[PDB]
Design a binder for this molecule. Structure first.
Ligand SMILES: NC(=O)c1ccc[n+]([C@@H]2O[C@H](COP(=O)([O-])OP(=O)(O)OC[C@H]3O[C@@H](n4cnc5c(N)ncnc54)[C@H](OP(=O)(O)O)[C@@H]3O)[C@@H](O)[C@H]2O)c1
Ligand SMILES: O=C(O)C1=C[C@@H](O)[C@@H](O)[C@H](O)C1
Ligand SMILES: O=C(O)C1=C[C@@H](O)[C@@H](O)[C@H](O)C1
Lengths: 263, 261
């Protein structure tokens, strides 16, 4: 039967096991998706076990960047972003992909959030990289900001983006929180309410809590908003299709995640 | 939502659509597998389409060899054999594999055919190369013959095997017809009756007719025989697993192919 897993440290609170349990069941497929606690020092030994016992696996912190080297093939996008979140095993060979980028795009689209820019991504980290990448290829003008200017400006040239000051947020039509600000902090938001734009949309990758201060403020300002669950659901559905050729219902996966969160 | 197909020319009488319709059904999956006529020249474009609406495809004559120069990745085995018969599509990328080689070995095992050599592969073409590759991997002493001596000599040095005269067949214990001799021609066989050994086994990749002159000669000599259907079924099943992660019943697929005949 189909054997899947999410590798990373920690993974005790990953919502993937629950989402893919729904995927397997709803598709009438026999298999399992487990969470394998895997530190970076155990990545090599774990990948070798993947080559022989798993059809595929997702990768989470802190294995997304240190995985490319141990795989037999890495997709272009995954090479540029410099991160792999989805691994496929066929004939003992491992192939690396990044479903976060496309997952993000499909979530916005399916969520009614127009890909009308300029889009501003807060955070020049791994999360920001994937998002910055996706918005570009989508056909939007994209700016990037980072708590630390260094990072931002460097990411702007690599991808060919524009590192702007936080104030520029007011001129953006798409705002994306790619920082860990607000994570389990209902009182925190990386962007002062006064810097929010008139019209546009806001997406927060943080889903704990679901309605972050960022989103609450964005909504009050009248912007379209989307939580972090839709992206989580699509990157997972896209990963399942990549492994089997079958796309589980993204809405159903988000719902499964929702239930696992208890909110 | 699983869209598959066999690319090649001709493919009008391919048994793959039947075998795979069974695989899908038997596995409670929804999908399709069609025969898609494709000439050498129409390949470069056909693959672009595959990238857009196909999860995977099988390639047959005369696309197997040319397909390599139009794929994102090719397996080490497919590379060495020099041919791809199975393509997987993910994120618009194309990966090439060869299930003919592993399929042949699985067919022999499932069919009760002992892996005992020397093995003589007749034909140094694409099918012969896949079979030779498989037999070499299995550790048997492999000999190869080809109507055109050069092709066999090149393959022998290339794979570290031995090119032999057709007469050495009397000393082989496993004989495999990987030539097109006998294809829809009951009067033709690649090996003269008198050159068959009196002990061993024979397998014919040609399955039209099912009981080729070659297999009838082998059977008449007392050799254990296997038709081309088990291999056709196993290469198909293995390809289906490459595409979905699921392995359909090879016996069931062979049965489906038999009926399609
Ligand atoms: N059962 C299965 O699943 C399966 C899988 C693969 C292939 N096959 C079958 O096995 C055959 C091999 O296919 P392929 O891709 O290798 O290419 P092909 O074009 O079908 O066959 C090429 C081979 O046949 C030889 N040949 C042709 N005419 C000959 C003749 N009159 N006398 C002696 N040898 C002759 C060639 O030798 P020269 O170098 O002298 O031309 C070469 O070795 C096909 O007929 C195919 O239908 C079956
Ligand atoms: O929490 C999880 O299980 C995941 C989180 C994201 O990083 C995804 O990119 C990953 O594929 C799975
Ligand atoms: O006739 C067919 O449909 C096929 C013939 C062989 O070349 C196989 O290698 C191919 O995958 C399917």
């Amino acid at each position: 039967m189909l054997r899947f897993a999410v590798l990373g440290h920690p993974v005790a609170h990953s919502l993937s096991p629950a989402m893919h349990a729904f995927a397997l069941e709803s598709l009438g497929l026999e298999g399992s998706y487990e969470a394998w606690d895997t530190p970076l020092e155990a990545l090599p030994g774990r990948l070798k076990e993947v080559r022989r016992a798993f059809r595929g696996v997702n990768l989470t912190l802190p294995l997304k960047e240190a995985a490319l080297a141990h795989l037999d093939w890495v997709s272009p996008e995954a090479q540029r972003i410099g991160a792999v979140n989805t691994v496929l095993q066929v004939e003992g060979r491992l192939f690396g992909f990044n479903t976060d980028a496309p997952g993000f795009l499909e979530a916005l689209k399916a969520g009614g959030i127009p890909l009308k820019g300029p889009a501003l991504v807060l955070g020049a980290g791994g999360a920001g990289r994937a998002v910055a990448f996706a918005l570009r290829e989508a056909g939007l003008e994209v700016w990037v900001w980072n708590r630390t200017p260094q990072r931002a400006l460097a990411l702007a040239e690599e991808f060919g983006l524009r590192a702007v000051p936080l104030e520029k947020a007011r001129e953006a039509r798409l705002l994306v929180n790619a920082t860990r600000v607000g994570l389990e902090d209902p009182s925190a938001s990386p962007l002062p309410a006064e810097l929010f734009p008139e019209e546009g949309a806001a997406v927060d990758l943080v889903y704990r809590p679901l309605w972050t201060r960022f989103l609450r403020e964005a909504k009050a300002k009248g912007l379209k908003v989307q939580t972090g669950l839709p992206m989580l659901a699509w990157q997972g559905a896209l990963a399942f299709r990549l492994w089997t050729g079958l796309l589980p219902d993204p809405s159903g996966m988000e719902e499964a995640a929702r239930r696992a969160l208890g909110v």
